[PDB]
Symmetry: D2
Subunit: 64 residues, 4 copies
Amino acid sequence: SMDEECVLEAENKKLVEDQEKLKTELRKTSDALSKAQNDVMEMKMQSERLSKEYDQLLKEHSEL
Amino acid sequence: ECVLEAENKKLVEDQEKLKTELRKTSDALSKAQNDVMEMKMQSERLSKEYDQLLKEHS
Amino acid sequence: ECVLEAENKKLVEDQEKLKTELRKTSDALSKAQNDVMEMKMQSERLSKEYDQLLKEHSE
Amino acid sequence: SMDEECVLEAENKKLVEDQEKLKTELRKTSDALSKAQNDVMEMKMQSERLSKEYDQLLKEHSEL
């Protein structure tokens, strides 16, 4: 026989479940930002090699 | 001219690598922003739930 | 009823604090994103003028 | 052909300068990203605090 206790339990359960979801979303967010961090580092190194290649190219070929 | 040609090929393909890397970075940040929208809505849900709990039972 | 009032005040302040942190975070991300798009434009200007350099002074 | 040395000089300076600008932008970008990552860590800590308070609240007050 359903009573108000029944509904109370449902509401509390919902509060807890949404806390869990916010936790999950936080983790997905940090994961994405860590991917971005790695990508930025990749760009840093790639850019340093590229800059060395530019330097080298202009040094060997004075007409450029 | 030979060495210049090879060097140029290398330089261009590395530029392409940088371009790809840029796109990937942008995409990652976009994913993070979407996630933050989600968290704003989720936390609004949490505080509304709490408020409702209080209004009903206190 | 008293302890409930105190705990509630505390809880509310922490919710608003979290809200502010979320806004702060989206702002920070928008800053980063703008920075990345700026690097995209810059790298395009760089490769473009490199192309012009080789087109003008090479075969 | 003095003009030639001119244009070539200007163009080289511009290539170098734009390399430098990309370098600077990469450094600042990494800074901004690090800022956002720490902001997310702060929200994790804050939301765990909120979770502890919700738990305590529902535990002490059965009518909630």
